[PDB]
Symmetry: C2
Subunit: 56 residues, 2 copies
């Protein structure tokens, strides 16, 4: 049960995180156009992460 | 000229990358629903990355 499938559940996990941390740092920065962009980004990166959770 | 602004150009850079690498690994995996999800994800993570490039 492939190690390629787990590594991808893993990257998708970590991208779900980075995008939240980035989102957070961009609020701090009142870089708010870009905050908004990263909110979307985070929300599709949990959509993917959870797509991966299921199928895997 | 804040180190908070550079760290965020940096995370956004790296997320642009991970999503491509993830996208690639998910083609390999013929996990194609999820490939499609990550293509979007990549494409908004370059949209953000380049939002950051400008303003910063």
């Amino acid at each position: 049960g492939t190690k390629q499938e787990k590594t991808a559940l893993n990257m998708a996990r970590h991208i779900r995180s980075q995008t939240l941390t980035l989102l957070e740092k961009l609020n701090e920065l009142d870089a708010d156009e870009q905050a908004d962009i990263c909110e979307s980004l985070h929300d599709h990166a949990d959509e993917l992460y959870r797509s991966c959770l299921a199928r895997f």
